[PDB]
Design a protein around this ligand. Structure first.
Ligand SMILES: CNC(=O)CNc1ccccc1C(=O)NC
Lengths: 231, 300
């Protein structure tokens, strides 16, 4: 059944699971035509598929060519998402395949269920949480690789950097969700907080700055305040 | 015109015969039902006065044998039996008719309701849904579960309706996942019609039998099956024009016959609103939409 506040530590047990967020799969800009009508122009998108225990992110980049000549794109986007997730699972060795896939939007349930009929022992679950994974395109390196892509491409990341060397998965996920909630509520503020101090750098192989333990507590403290102020 | 005699009526019971029904008092001199129209299947159900909750009954076709009812005090119900001695049967019936102890199947001449509800229903197909091969007639009650219900527990007492499941490998061709789920025409026309049912008459016959079971016995699994078979057609973009026109007629007479106050526990809001207003066939069921809007506008 649904994942919610109450069954939250289940994310960090030893059953392999993946979150799937489809928010950023189909992305458009809306503009005026010469005749004064409105049209859309698609831009590259991505499926955000995340192991919350390990931090492994399977970022399938959705190139705008996949929409060429297609109708009802918002509906197609959900089925394309489910096709790509199913292909990902099939590409993994059996012992690496997830036992559960949690979709962040309920409209992904039927598309994913139908695509995973071959995998009856993989539970497809919704969630009651309002998770902030849409803000993943506010992470500069992720946005950069999506916009530069010239063809369909899968890019692998660890969205926790090296945090698991020092903190537990539960704490890592809480930090991630806090950073993303902040970036979603006020991206400019949030980003100022993270890069204010020029002496703290982002390693080439990382997404976030190399904060010490103490600096992370400071960072996490203004971000929780940026969120309170906006609300 | 055929007859189903009753040995006796030892317990107070409401007896139905197709869409008709009458009350019989405890030990009333009732000895059965005459003038039953030949050419159609029929159903004779029972509702004990002391047990309102349960209805049990028998599907039969008088062309297939001489049938009678006899109460069994051990099992506590009216049982259908076959009389193999044709002369013993003619004699029993004639005696009961002579003493005028039988009700007459009360068909108005203008009235085509029963034909319209049973147009495609055949005894031989009923007997494959209700498996009890030593009898020519078939027992059904309010509590019998369907094979698909059991999958989700006695197999001998099950309703073996054709399993329909929209999120199943049978329904969804590899590589046409989205196409087959949003347009079920390949599941309807190839898997079910060409493959399983063979023709639309058999499909419609099972659909009609499910409704009748659903209305007459208040059988929940049968109601699920009726709606599933409607939804499969309405969710198909490509349906033969003759099937759509016949479906509209079929459903029209089912909705017409449904008791107005037994409708809220039987009609599935989602299926009907989808079928009449969202589906590919939203514009193809004119008679059914008009009677639904005038008789159950609340549901919609
Ligand atoms: C089809 N819905 C129904 O309520 C059919 N109706 C009965 C079915 C079984 C036993 C009793 C009844 C009845 O007299 N009122 C409910």
């Amino acid at each position: 059944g649904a994942m919610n506040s109450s069954n939250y530590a289940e994310l960090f047990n030893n059953d392999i699971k993946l979150f799937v967020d489809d928010t950023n799969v189909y992305r458009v800009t809306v503009h005026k035509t010469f005749e004064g009508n409105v049209a859309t122009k698609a831009i590259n998108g991505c499926i955000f598929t995340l192991n919350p225990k390990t931090g492994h992110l399977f970022l399938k980049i959705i190139h705008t060519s996949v929409w060429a000549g297609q109708k009802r794109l918002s509906q197609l986007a959900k089925w394309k998402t489910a096709e790509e997730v199913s292909a990902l699972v099939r590409s993994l060795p059996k012992e690496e395949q997830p036992k559960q896939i949690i979709v962040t939007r309920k409209a992904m349930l039927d598309p994913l269920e139908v695509h995973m009929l071959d995998f009856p022992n993989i539970a497809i679950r919704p969630t009651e949480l309002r998770l902030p994974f849409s803000a993943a395109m506010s992470i500069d390196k992720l946005s950069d690789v999506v916009m530069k892509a010239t063809e369909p491409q899968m890019v692998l990341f660890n969205i926790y950097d090296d945090w698991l060397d020092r903190i537990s998965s539960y704490t890592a996920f809480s930090r991630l969700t806090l950073l993303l909630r902040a970036l979603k509520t006020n991206e400019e503020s949030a980003k100022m907080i993270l890069l204010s101090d020029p002496t703290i750098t982002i390693k080439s192989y990382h997404l976030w700055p190399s904060f010490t333990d103490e600096q992370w507590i400071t960072i996490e403290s203004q971000m929780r305040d940026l969120i309170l102020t906006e609300y | 015109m055929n007859t189903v005699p009753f040995t006796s009526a030892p317990i107070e019971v409401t007896i139905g015969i197709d869409q008709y029904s009458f009350n019989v008092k405890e030990n009333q001199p009732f000895h059965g039902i005459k003038d039953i129209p030949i050419g159609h299947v029929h159903v004779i159900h029972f509702q004990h006065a002391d047990n309102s909750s349960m209805r049990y009954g028998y599907w039969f076709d008088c062309r297939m044998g001489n049938f009678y009812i006899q109460y069994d005090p051990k099992d506590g119900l009216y049982k259908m039996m076959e009389e193999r001695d044709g002369a013993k049967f003619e004699n029993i019936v004639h005696n009961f008719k002579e003493r005028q102890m039988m009700v007459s199947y009360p068909k108005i001449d203008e009235d085509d309701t029963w034909y319209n509800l049973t147009e495609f229903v055949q005894m031989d197909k009923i007997r494959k849904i209700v498996r009890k091969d030593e009898n020519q007639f078939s027992y059904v009650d309010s509590s019998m579960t369907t094979v698909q219900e059991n999958e989700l527990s006695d197999p001998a007492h099950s309703l073996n309706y054709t399993v329909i499941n929209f999120k199943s490998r049978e329904a969804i061709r590899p590589g046409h996942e989205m196409e087959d789920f949003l347009d079920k025409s390949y599941y309807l026309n190839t898997v079910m019609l060409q493959g399983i049912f063979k023709n639309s008459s058999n499909y419609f016959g099972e659909l009609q039998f499910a409704f009748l079971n659903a209305m007459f016995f208040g059988n929940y699994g049968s109601s699920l099956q009726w709606h599933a078979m409607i939804e499969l057609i309405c969710s198909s973009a490509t349906v033969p024009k003759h099937m759509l026109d016949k479906l509209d007629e079929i459903l029209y007479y089912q909705i017409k016959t449904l008791p107005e106050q037994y409708s809220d526990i039987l009609l599935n809001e989602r299926v009907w609103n989808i079928c009449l207003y969202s589906s590919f066939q939203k514009n193809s069921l004119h008679n059914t939409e008009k009677i639904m809007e005038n008789k159950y506008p609340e549901l919609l």
